[model samples]
Target: KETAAAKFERQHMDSSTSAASSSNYCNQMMKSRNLTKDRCKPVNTFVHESLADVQAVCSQKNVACKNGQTNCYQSYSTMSITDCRETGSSKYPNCAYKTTQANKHIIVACEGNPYVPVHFDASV
Candidate 1:
C-alpha cells in the first residue's frame, strides 16, 4: 500500500504535469493563429466626433464668422465629413448648432471587416 504522503505527492505531480501540458496546448493553439510579433495588427478606429466637430467649427469659422460658404467638411482618422452646410441636407438635414451637439456619432469598421462597425464615441 502507498503511504498517504506518497499518494499526495503522486497526485500533485500528475496535476502539475497535466496543467503544464494544457498550458502548452493552449500556447500552440494561439500560435496556430499566426499571431506572431511581426504579424500582429493594430486595432484602430476613426475618431468621428472630433471630425464632425472640426467640420462644424470650420463651418462656423468660414461661414458664420468669416461670412463665407456654407458647404464644408473635415477628415480625421479614417473618416471624412463633406457638404456640411448650415442648413442640413436631405440625408442629414438640420441647422448647424454649436452647443456640443451629442447627436453626432462615429461608426468605424475594420479595413477588411465591414459588418463590424466598432463604436468608439457616440456622443459629441
Candidate 2:
C-alpha cells in the first residue's frame, strides 16, 4: 500500500548529512526522488534526520496544524533541514530550485492505530 505515511517519507526524508548548499541538490534530488516527473513541485523540504527520529514526532504533544488539525506534533528539538523553492522561470521537466538549509523544530500530522507521520505540516 502506498500509504500517506510512505508518501510523506518519499517527499520529505533525506536522511543524510550530504551537502545541502550545492546549486543542483534540489534539481537532482527532486527528480531522482520522482517529484519532478509530472511538474515541478513549487516548494518542498528535506529533513536531514533519520526516519526513526522523525517517526518519534508522532509521540510528541499535539500542536495546531495549518488547517487547524490537532493531530500535528512538533519535534522536541530542532533538526537540520533543507528547503527547496522552485525558481520563477522553472517549468515542468526542467525544474529548478533554490536550496536553503536550516535547523528548526519540525511539525507533522499523524494518523491510524499505530500512529505515524502522514503529512509534513511545518518547521519553526
Candidate 3:
C-alpha cells in the first residue's frame, strides 16, 4: 500500500513545472498522474516545490486543519501552485479539467517520524 505522504506527492507535487500556461495542463496532468484514471478528481492542487521544501512546513507554525486537526502547518512563503478542477461535463475515462495557477501559502497536515506532509489542506 502507498503511504499517505507518497500519495500526497503523487497527487500534489509537480516541482518540475512552474506556472503552467496550457488550458489542458490539468487534463493531461491528471491523467498522466493517474488521478483521472478511476474517476475525475473534482478539485486537486499541485505544488511546484521540492519534497524537502514542502516538508519543511512542518517546522513552521502549527494551525488547525479544516478537519479540525492540530497537526497542520502553513507555509512561511508563497509558492508556485496549480489547481486542477474537473469540468462539469467531464466524465470518467475521458476526464477534463480547468487549470488555474497562482502563488500562495499552502497548508498541510504532517505526521510520522520525520514529520512530513500527509495531507494538503488549502492554499491562501
Candidate 4:
C-alpha cells in the first residue's frame, strides 16, 4: 500500500512540470502520477510549490471538507497549482484539463498526521 506521504505526493505535487504545449497537463499527469490506476481519477489537484510551505498549511484555518468532515484547512497564502478535472472520453472520464495557474487558497483534510494533508479536497 502507498504511504500517506507518498499518496499525497502522487496526488498533489508537480513542481517539475513546465508548459503543456499540447495543454495536456492533467491528461498526462493523472496517468504518470499513477492516479489513473484502475480508472482515471475524476478530479485531482497538484500543488506547485515547496513541500515545506505546502505542509505548513496544516497550521492554517480549519474548514468544512467536501464530504462533510471537519478536518479541512485553507491556506493563508495563495499558492500556484494545477486543477485537473476530467473531461470528454470514449469510456470513463479520461480526458484533459486545461493547465491553469491560479493564486488561490487551498483547502484540504487532515488525518493521523494532523499537520499533514490527507486529502486534496479543494482550492479557492
Model number with the top TM-score = 3
TM-score, ranked from best to worst: 3, 2, 4, 1
Model 3, span 22-70: residue lDDT tens: 8888988899889977778899999999889999999997999999999
- Which tens-of-lDDT digit does each residue in 47-90 have in candidate 1? 22332242333222111112232332222323221111121221
lDDT against the true structure, each candidate: 0.24, 0.89, 0.91, 0.76
lDDT of 4 by residue, 1-124 (tens): 9878668977898767533334577778877887777776677788888878878888899888888898899999888887777666524444455556566799977777546887888888
Provide TM-scores for the models: 0.16, 0.93, 0.96, 0.84
Task: Show model 2 residue runs off by greater than 4 Å.
Answer: 18-21
Query: Could you tell me the lDDT of residue 53 within candidate 3?
Result: 92
lDDT of 4: 0.76
Select the stronger candidate by TM-score from 1 and 3: 3
TM-score of 2: 0.93
Least accurate 10 contiguous residues by lDDT in model 3 = 15-24
Q: Give me the candidate number with maximum lDDT.
A: 3
All candidates in order of lDDT, best leading: 3, 2, 4, 1
Give the per-residue lDDT of model 2 (tens digit) for 44-121.
Answer: 989998999999999986899999989999999999888889998798889999888889999999998779999888
